[PDB]
């Protein structure tokens, strides 16, 4: 077990932090975040350094560290 805190930043500049393990499938984070915004998880896309976070990605796989940022955008097409 090894935990890290990630900062999730939404379209309106709000932030929610998540404490997760390096091995945590990031679907859990996506679901929780969408839940707290009251929108369906599949209306959102979650990006790390601009790349899409897959349900089965982990922080270790993406090379995330303590206090890294995840951005949340509306799912495309919309700009």
């Amino acid at each position: 077990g090894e935990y890290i805190k990630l900062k999730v930043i939404g379209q309106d500049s709000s932030e929610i932090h998540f404490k997760v393990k390096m091995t945590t499938h990031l679907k859990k984070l996506k679901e929780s975040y969408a839940q707290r915004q009251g929108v369906p998880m599949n209306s959102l896309r979650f990006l790390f350094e601009g790349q899409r976070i897959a349900d089965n990605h982990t922080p270790k796989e993406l090379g995330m560290e303590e206090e890294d940022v995840i951005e949340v955008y509306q799912e495309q097409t919309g700009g």
Binding site: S14, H17, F18, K19, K21, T24, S32
Partner: peptide, 11 residues
């Protein structure tokens, strides 16, 4: 300013 929000994800 929003308060700090930390959610711990179990495993």
């Amino acid at each position: 300013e929003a308060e700090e929000r930390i959610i711990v994800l179990s495993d």
